[PDB]
Amino acid sequence: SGFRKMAFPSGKVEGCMVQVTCGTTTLNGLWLDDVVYCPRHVICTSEDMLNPNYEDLLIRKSNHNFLVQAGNVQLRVIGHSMQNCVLKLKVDTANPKTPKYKFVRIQPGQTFSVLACYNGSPSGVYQCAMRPNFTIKGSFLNGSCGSVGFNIDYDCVSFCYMHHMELPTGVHAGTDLEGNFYGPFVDRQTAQAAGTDTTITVNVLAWLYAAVINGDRWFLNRFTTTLNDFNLVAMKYNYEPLTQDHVDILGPLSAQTGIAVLDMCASLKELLQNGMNGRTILGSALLEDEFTPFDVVRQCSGVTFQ
Amino acid sequence: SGFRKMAFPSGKVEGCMVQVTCGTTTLNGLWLDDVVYCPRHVICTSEDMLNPNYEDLLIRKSNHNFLVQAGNVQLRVIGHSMQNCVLKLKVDTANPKTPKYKFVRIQPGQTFSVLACYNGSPSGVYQCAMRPNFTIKGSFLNGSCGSVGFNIDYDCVSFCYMHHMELPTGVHAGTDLEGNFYGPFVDRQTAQAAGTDTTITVNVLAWLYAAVINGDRWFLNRFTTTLNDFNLVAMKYNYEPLTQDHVDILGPLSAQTGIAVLDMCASLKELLQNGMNGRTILGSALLEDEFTPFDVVRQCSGVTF
Ligand SMILES: CN(C)C(=O)C[C@@]1(C(=O)Nc2cncc3ccccc23)CCOc2ccc(Cl)cc21
Ligand SMILES: CN(C)C(=O)C[C@@]1(C(=O)Nc2cncc3ccccc23)CCOc2ccc(Cl)cc21
Numbered sequence: 001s002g003f004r005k006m007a008f009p010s011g012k013v014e015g016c017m018v019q020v021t022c023g024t025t026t027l028n029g030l031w032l033d034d035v036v037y038c039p040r041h042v043i044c045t046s047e048d049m050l051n052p053n054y055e056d057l058l059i060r061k062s063n064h065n066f067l068v069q070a071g072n073v074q075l076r077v078i079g080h081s082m083q084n085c086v087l088k089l090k091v092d093t094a095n096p097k098t099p100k101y102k103f104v105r106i107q108p109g110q111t112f113s114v115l116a117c118y119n120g121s122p123s124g125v126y127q128c129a130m131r132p133n134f135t136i137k138g139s140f141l142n143g144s145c146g147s148v149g150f151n152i153d154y155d156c157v158s159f160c161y162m163h164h165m166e167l168p169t170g171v172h173a174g175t176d177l178e179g180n181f182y183g184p185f186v187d188r189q190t191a192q193a194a195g196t197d198t199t200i201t202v203n204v205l206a207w208l209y210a211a212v213i214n215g216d217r218w219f220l221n222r223f224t225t226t227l228n229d230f231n232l233v234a235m236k237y238n239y240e241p242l243t244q245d246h247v248d249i250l251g252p253l254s255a256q257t258g259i260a261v262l263d264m265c266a267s268l269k270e271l272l273q274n275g276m277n278g279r280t281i282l283g284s285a286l287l288e289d290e291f292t293p294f295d296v297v298r299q300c301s302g303v304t305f306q
Numbered sequence: 307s308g309f310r311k312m313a314f315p316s317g318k319v320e321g322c323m324v325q326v327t328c329g330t331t332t333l334n335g336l337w338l339d340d341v342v343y344c345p346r347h348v349i350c351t352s353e354d355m356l357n358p359n360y361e362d363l364l365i366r367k368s369n370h371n372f373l374v375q376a377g378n379v380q381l382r383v384i385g386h387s388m389q390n391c392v393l394k395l396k397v398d399t400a401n402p403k404t405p406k407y408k409f410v411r412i413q414p415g416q417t418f419s420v421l422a423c424y425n426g427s428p429s430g431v432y433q434c435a436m437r438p439n440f441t442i443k444g445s446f447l448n449g450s451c452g453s454v455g456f457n458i459d460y461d462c463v464s465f466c467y468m469h470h471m472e473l474p475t476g477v478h479a480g481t482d483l484e485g486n487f488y489g490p491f492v493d494r495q496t497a498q499a500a501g502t503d504t505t506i507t508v509n510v511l512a513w514l515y516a517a518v519i520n521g522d523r524w525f526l527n528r529f530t531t532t533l534n535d536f537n538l539v540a541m542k543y544n545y546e547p548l549t550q551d552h553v554d555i556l557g558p559l560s561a562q563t564g565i566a567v568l569d570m571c572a573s574l575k576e577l578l579q580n581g582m583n584g585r586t587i588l589g590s591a592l593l594e595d596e597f598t599p600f601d602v603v604r605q606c607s608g609v610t611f
Contacts, residue, residue, distance in 0.1 A: 001446075001447075001472060001476040002443060002444050002445040002446060002472075002476055002477070002478065003445055004430075004432040004434070004443075004444065004445035005311060005432065006422070006430035006431065006432045006445060007313060007430065007431050007432065008430060008431070009316045009317075009320050009421060009428035009429070009430065009431050010315045010316050010317060010431065011315070011316055011317030011318075011320035011321065011428070012317075014315050014317040015317065115315065116312070117610070118608045118610050119610065121610030121611065122315040122317075122610065122611060123315070123604075123608055123609060123610040123611060124310075124312035124313065124314065124315065124604075124605065125312065125313050125314070125315055125316065125431055126310040126311065126312045126313070128310070137308060137589075138308050138310065139307075139308035139309055139310040139312065139605060140307070140308060141606075141607075141608045143608065144608075166307060170307035170308060170520070170521070171308075172308070214476060215476065276591075280592070283443065283592075284590075284592070285590070285591035285592045286586070286589075286590065286591050299430070299445060300447075301447050301448075305476070
């Protein structure tokens with residue numbers, strides 16, 4: 001029993017973290033096989049940050065301009081190419097610690113672990129969700145660029161995020177490992193703002209099921225609702241609408257706890273209306289939305305605590 | 307910017323996790339050098355746990371009764387001994403992935419990362435604090451025993467916890483790596499209950515400093531308090547007393563933010579007597595107490611491992 005925001009063990013990603021230096025810029029790279037992936041903005045030189053022409057800046061670079069360091073060993077860059085907003089540095093050594101991996105593009109509401117790095121050295125690991133506005137609420141200081149988001153499912157690392165920038169509100173933006181940004185963001189210092197963030201409703205419902213599995217029940221009620229009436233109330237609290245796909249994915253938790261999805265939806269409807277009244281759910285006074293239905297099933301047992 | 311509950315990178319510990327099987331019981335072991343450490347209750351069946359004589363159960367065991375598996379390789383147990391509530395299995399192979407390490411006993415309020423494991427395989431890493439009642443509010447299912455708690459200092463792993471059991475309230479109990487339980491717990495299936503938990507006051511203050519570093523400052527007030535008047539109020543709300551050592555350890559955060567420790571205490575004093583009033587601090591409606599002053603400095607400065 002118990003419920004924690006749990007990150008995947010970061011060891012498989014730690015053995016891939018390297019330091020990439022281009023001129024005065026130093027950030028992190030992900031060394032997989034004989035390729036080092038990093039944000040392409042490592043090549044930007046002060047006046048090439050408002051409107052950088054990356055194709056032109058990269059053409060002017062040689063392999064000898066990129067300094068790649070893996071621990072206390074300097075890797076030899078033998079090629080460089082760009083794929084969207086990610087720079088790929090071909091090196092003369094395959095990473096002997098390369099895990100089984102894949103590059104996956106995730107959708108909002110999905111969770112992943114972040115291995116925060118500085119100068120190619122891992123400093124911390126935390127769990128977060130891709131917000132509906134395509135930002136992540138990370139914890140990153142200058143030098144964290146190139147830090148990666150990942151999931152580990154059954155021996156294989158799925159790389160889903162690479163950190164590129166911090167927006168004016170302190171939230172973070174990045175790309176998948178193919179260099180495509182999540183959200184309407186660009187790797188330019190031009191005026192950028194995240195859209196108004198909203199609550200990942202399916203994740204709140206999954207977390208309420210986790211609370212019931214862990215013995216919490218005070219928020220439960222005898223009501224049920226239609227999916228449409230629930231969505232009408234939820235959107236008034238900046239909660240995202242719940243689709244039939246979300247109701248289906250909540251099915252196993254519904255079967256495990258004996259609380260139908262729309263029965264739980266009526267409990268969430270009441271929680272939004274009254275507040276918590278000095279009570280907590282899984283030690284939290286706010287509704288948690290960074291646990292997917294998959295995370296709750298992964299973390300929780302097969303038998304519900306009665 | 308941003309503030310997250312952050313665990314140490316778990317790689318150095320992952321290379322030490324092995325599966326230990328004794329009879330029908332399977333749990334996790336920590337393979338360091340040529341020794342596998344695990345909870346001694348792996349020698350227990352079902353009746354044994356009700357009233358166990360571990361010295362007697364262990365004497366009846368032979369090295370071949372212990373099945374130790376590191377990945378898909380079986381390790382040969384060549385010796386077995388007990389140190390308090392931990393079983394030490396001498397193996398014929400030193401772990402080539404043994405990091406620089408030490409065994410440290412932590413105090414309540416101190417934080418550490420937990421590498422939750424099942425069948426010697428790491429499944430998750432999370433950060434938690436040793437509660438003042440010596441329990442940890444972990445997330446553990448059956449098979450998680452032997453999962454370890456650790457911190458990292460420079461390139462050295464300090465092992466501070468090994469999971470042994472779950473109490474009736476769902477909170478967890480375990481030992482240091484020398485087998486000594488944290489708290490008044492015993493490794494037996496008997497009526498046990500954690501004492502009433504209290505809030506780690508120095509950690510709340512550190513988290514308030516982290517909020518000020520991140521621009522969240524609505525709770526700051528003009529007031530200050532004495533350490534004695536603060537403690538009188540804190541005791542009343544089931545908050546741990548704040549000592550001069552805590553005030554000293556909060557010194558760098560005080561210097562960085564320009565808010566004296568006793569100035570921040572008057573802020574906490576008001577938050578306790580009045581609540582948050584519909585506001586949040588670092589996105590939380592409750593005061594967070596699982597970040598030490600060192601965790602806040604480490605995160606709001608980027609110390610790497
Ligand atoms: C991984 N999880 C938990 C998801 O829900 C992913 C996701 C989803 O709906 N997420 C979204 C939740 N809520 C709000 C959102 C706003 C904008 C954008 C997405 C939002 C992503 C989109 O495609 C599907 C399709 C099918 C299912 Cl079952 C889920 C999803
Ligand atoms: C290093 N270089 C070349 C930069 O320009 C990085 C930078 C950035 O956001 N870095 C940051 C990441 N994450 C956290 C941070 C915290 C504080 C301070 C900075 C942080 C800073 C300037 O604004 C942009 C704009 C667009 C892109 Cl893609 C990157 C950036």
